[PDB]
Amino acid sequence: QDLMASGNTTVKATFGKDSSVVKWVVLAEVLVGAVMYMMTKNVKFLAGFAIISVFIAVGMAVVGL
Amino acid sequence: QDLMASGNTTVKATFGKDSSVVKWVVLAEVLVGAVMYMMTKNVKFLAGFAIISVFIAVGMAVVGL
Amino acid sequence: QDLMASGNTTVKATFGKDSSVVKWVVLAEVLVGAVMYMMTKNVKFLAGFAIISVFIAVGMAVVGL
Amino acid sequence: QDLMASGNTTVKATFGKDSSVVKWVVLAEVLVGAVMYMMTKNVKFLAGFAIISVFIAVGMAVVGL
Amino acid sequence: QDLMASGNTTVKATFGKDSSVVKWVVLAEVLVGAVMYMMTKNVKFLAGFAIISVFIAVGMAVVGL
Amino acid sequence: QDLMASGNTTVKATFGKDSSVVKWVVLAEVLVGAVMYMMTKNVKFLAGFAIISVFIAVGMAVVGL
Amino acid sequence: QDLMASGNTTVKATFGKDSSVVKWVVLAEVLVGAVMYMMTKNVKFLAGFAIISVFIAVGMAVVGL
Amino acid sequence: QDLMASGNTTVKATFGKDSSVVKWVVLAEVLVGAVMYMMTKNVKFLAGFAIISVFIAVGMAVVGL
Amino acid sequence: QDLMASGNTTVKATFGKDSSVVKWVVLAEVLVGAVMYMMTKNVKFLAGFAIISVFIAVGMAVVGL
Amino acid sequence: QDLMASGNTTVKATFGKDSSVVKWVVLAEVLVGAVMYMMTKNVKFLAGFAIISVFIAVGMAVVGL
Amino acid sequence: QDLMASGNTTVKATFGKDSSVVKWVVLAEVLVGAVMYMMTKNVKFLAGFAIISVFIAVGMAVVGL
Amino acid sequence: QDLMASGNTTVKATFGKDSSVVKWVVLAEVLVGAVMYMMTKNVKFLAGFAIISVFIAVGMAVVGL
Amino acid sequence: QDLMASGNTTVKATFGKDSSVVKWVVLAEVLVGAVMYMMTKNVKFLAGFAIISVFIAVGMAVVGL
Amino acid sequence: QDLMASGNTTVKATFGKDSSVVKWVVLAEVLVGAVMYMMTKNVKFLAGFAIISVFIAVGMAVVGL
Amino acid sequence: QDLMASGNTTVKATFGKDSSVVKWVVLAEVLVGAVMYMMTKNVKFLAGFAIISVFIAVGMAVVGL
Amino acid sequence: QDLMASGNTTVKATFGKDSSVVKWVVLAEVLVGAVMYMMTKNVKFLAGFAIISVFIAVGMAVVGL
Amino acid sequence: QDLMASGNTTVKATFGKDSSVVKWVVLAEVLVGAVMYMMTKNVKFLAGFAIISVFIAVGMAVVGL
Amino acid sequence: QDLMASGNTTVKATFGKDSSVVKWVVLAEVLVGAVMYMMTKNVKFLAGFAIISVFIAVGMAVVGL
Amino acid sequence: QDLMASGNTTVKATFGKDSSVVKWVVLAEVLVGAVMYMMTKNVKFLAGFAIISVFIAVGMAVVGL
Amino acid sequence: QDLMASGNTTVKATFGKDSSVVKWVVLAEVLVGAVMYMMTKNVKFLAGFAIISVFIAVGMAVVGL
């Protein structure tokens, strides 16, 4: 017998490296930086905009099925 | 099956590179600079007015769906 | 569907290039210069009176919706 | 007589070091970090992404049948 | 024989993507944000107002019968 | 059959865009700003006074039944 | 049916544009300025004395029921 | 019903244009000027002695209940 | 036949808009505010003193038999 | 029948506008101000000393049975 | 019945206008001034030494049972 | 009953007008003056050496138990 | 017949205003304050040391049989 | 009958004014001051070293059996 | 019975006036002064080096078992 | 039993009067003087170069284990 | 007859002051401190390492059979 | 009988003074310092790097079986 | 048995003295210095660029497995 | 297994010695010098223009992957 936990894993395709879910955060990332940059006017919050992106890239690349 | 996280993403069009949400901050940006410039009279707070703008541009351009 | 962040943006008209909010700072600008010019008697604080004005102009002109 | 608790242990192969079940968490791991990193923008939540991975590795390696 | 769990599913129409039940939360959403925004005056609670809406949209769209 | 969740929705009229409930927060909004402005004397807390208002406007306008 | 959130709104008359509650802050306003002006001797804290007043005026005028 | 925030407002009479509280600052005003005038020997700190006085006068006169 | 759940509803008069039970909380309200205000010295806890009062008013007014 | 929640309300006289319980807080009020004033040496904590007093006055006056 | 919150109020005599507890702060007052005066050498911290004293006097005099 | 806050007040004798604690500051006073006089060579820092001394004297004399 | 719940009430004498049981807490009170004062070094935990004592006094005095 | 809560109260002698338990905190007191003084280098944490000591003294003296 | 909190108090000898633990801070003391003196170059941080030492001395001498 | 805080105190040898750690600061000392001397060209910053050195010497000599 | 609850009490020797079970916690103690010290980098978690040890010592010494 | 809690204590060898588990933290230690040093640029976080190391050394040395 | 915490420690190779993770900070180090140097234009932030580097070197060299 | 922290490091190419990010600061460098040179007219701010450049060069050259 094979493993029955499988089937679909469209879940991947749902969460896939390019999917709906993934992109959203980046917008939030872009938003929240612009958000928090307003009050502080510190150049801080513009980071994961780079980082998160490449983070998720290798992050997803680690497994991503 | 496709990914079911999708549908609309009018959310994009709601947050889209030219949308309501985006522009607001810029005003705040323009405001808060004029705000904080008053007390300090330092030429500092006039930056992201350029930066944030082009920031969000490429920032949105990074993904923006 | 359209973006639901919209509606009014009388907020613009509230913050609009000629609106209530905008003008106030300029007075403060004019005031605070006269303010700080008193103690220093340095010709410094008479600037953004020009600058801020034209600043906000193009500043608002950048987007201002 | 042998032990009758045995048979299959495809359960292993179902939970096996590389199986369906295992990978899912990592995605969640990658997700939730990106999740919680948004609100805090603290570099914290990017850890078990390394840790959990190698954790489960030796963790599974401890027994994993 | 067919499935006898069926019949009506006016329940859908009762919970349907546009129904009574659905809308209520959004008001609460709009309310509670205005609620909690008062004490904190943090721009936080104005989110699901967007999110929940589009959330339920695709959320309902996932199945919604 | 129709949906039985309905009936009244005077609740709307109770929470309606112009109703009792709505206005209260604005006062609180006006109050709490004057409140917190006292201790800080920062021009911050005078915002949602604009924002919340127009916020609820489109916010209610999003659905508001 | 009408909205049952109503009744009294003497609360208004309690918070009304001229009421007890309103005036208090102004005194505090006048006080705290004189307060903080002592230590700094900066002409700063004499502002909302004008501002807050007219602020609350239009502020209350925005809704104030 | 009337507003129940009222009653006493002896608080006024406690803070009243001529009351205990009011006068104190003026002494401090007179003191701190003499204080800070010593170290600087600049004729500066003798101002609000006039200003604060008339300030509070119209200041209290603005509302003062 | 009429409903036999009735009779007395002195319970109302026992809980009535002006009764024993009602008033107690207000004292507690007044107390607990003074209570918690001591430790924090935050102006917070002086609210429901207004709110609860008018709250119960319309609250009782909603039905109160 | 009358309401049986009544009887005594010596509780009032126990909590009465002049009673034991009431006064205590004021001492604490006077204490804690002197307390917290020590560390900060900010003139802040001397307030409710006035406020709380008159607060409880009208506060008790609101109902106080 | 009388109020049972009473009895002793030696607590007063424990906190009384001349008691143990009261005096301590004044020493701290005298100390902390000498403390903080050292680092700043600003004539500031010698105040409540007068103020606190007379403060507590009338402060206690307000009620002090 | 008497006040139980009492007992010892060797604390006085520990902080007493002539005690250990008192004298220390004076040395610091003498030191820090010599300290800060070095860099400035301004005759300033030789003051509380007189002042603090007599300050603490009457200061302690105010109460000092 | 009399009430048979009685007899002994040495329980009182066991819990009596001066008994074993009573005193223990005070020690704990004294201990736990010294306990929690260590970590915080906040002057807080030295209170019920007064309060609890007089609390139990009138507290016991309320009935204490 | 006597109270049976008694017996030993070596517990006192275990917690007694001079016992093991008592002294420990003082060391911690001495330690934690030296601890927290390091990071701040504020002269603050050297207090209860006096205070706690005499505190516990009268504190224990209050009852201490 | 004796007190059972005792035994060892090698803890003393572990924390004893000359022990491991004690000395460490002094090094830190010496270090942190040299640390913070670098950035400020203020002669400040060379104090507890004397003070802490003699502080702990009498400090330990106060009890130190 | 002996004190178990001991063992190694190679920490000393790690921080020892001649160790790695010690010397570093001196370089920084030499550096920062040359650093800050550049901008001011004041002969000031050449001091602890002597002082710190001999400072740490006796400083370490005070205890240094 | 003797007590039959006895026999073995190798349980002691199993839990004995030096046994397997005892030591484990100390490692955990040492571990968890190093654990929690990482995230906070507060010097806190290095305590029971001393305390627990001597704690269990006298703790076991209290009875330990 | 001997104690049956024993056997293996490879757990030691698993946690042993030189084992896998031990070293990890040190890396984290080295990491987190470099981590937190970035944002603050305070020389603080480089400590337990020494301390934790020698800490665990004697710490493990205390028992470590 | 051997210790089962082992296996991989590719984690080392993942965090190894030359690995991905290590280098990143240095860039940040180089960045943040250039970052913070801009606003201050103080020559400060160019340090750990040397320090952190050699820091991590010996730091990793301390254990690094 | 290899280290999974890797992948991309386009991050380098994103931050690479010649990349977008790098150049920006230099402009700011050139700007801010011209900025701050205006007010002071001191020849100071024209430095890192050289320095930062070559700084980042070797700085990046130190590692830069």
Side-chain angles (χ1 to χ4, degrees), chain F residues 10-33:
Chain F
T10 303
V11 174
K12 177 178 75 179
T14 300
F15 297 94
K17 297 179 178 178
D18 286 346
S19 174
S20 174
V21 177
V22 179
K23 301 177 178 179
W24 300 77
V25 174
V26 178
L27 295 179
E29 162 65 10
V30 174
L31 297 179
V32 299

Side-chain angles (χ1 to χ4, degrees), chain D residues 50 54 57-58 61-63, chain S residues 4-8 11 15:
Chain D
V54 294
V58 293
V62 169
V63 178
Chain S
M4 289 182 70
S6 64
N8 279 337
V11 174
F15 297 94

Side-chain angles (χ1 to χ4, degrees), chain T residues 3 8-9 12 18 21 25 31 33 37-39 43 45 49 55 61 63:
Chain T
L3 70 91
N8 279 337
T9 65
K12 177 178 75 179
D18 287 345
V21 177
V25 174
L31 297 179
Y37 176 75
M38 292 183 290
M39 294 181 69
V43 177
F45 313 102
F49 155 76
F55 159 73
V63 178

Side-chain angles (χ1 to χ4, degrees), chain K residues 4-8 11 15, chain M residues 50 54 57-58 61-63:
Chain K
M4 289 182 70
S6 64
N8 279 337
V11 174
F15 297 94
Chain M
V54 294
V58 293
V62 169
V63 178

Side-chain angles (χ1 to χ4, degrees), chain C residues 4-8 11 15, chain F residues 50 54 57-58 61-63:
Chain C
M4 289 182 70
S6 64
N8 279 337
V11 174
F15 297 94
Chain F
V54 294
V58 293
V62 169
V63 178

Side-chain angles (χ1 to χ4, degrees), chain T residues 5-56:
Chain T
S6 64
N8 279 337
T9 65
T10 303
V11 174
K12 177 178 75 179
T14 300
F15 297 94
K17 297 179 178 178
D18 287 345
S19 174
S20 174
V21 177
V22 179
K23 301 177 178 179
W24 300 77
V25 174
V26 178
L27 295 179
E29 162 65 10
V30 174
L31 297 179
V32 299
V35 172
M36 296 306 295
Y37 176 75
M38 292 183 290
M39 294 181 69
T40 68
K41 298 307 182 188
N42 302 343
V43 177
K44 294 168 58 182
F45 313 102
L46 289 65
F49 155 76
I51 303 169
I52 293 173
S53 62
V54 294
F55 159 73
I56 294 171

Side-chain angles (χ1 to χ4, degrees), chain G residues 4-8 11 15, chain I residues 50 54 57-58 61-63:
Chain G
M4 289 182 70
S6 64
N8 279 337
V11 174
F15 297 94
Chain I
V54 294
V58 293
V62 169
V63 178

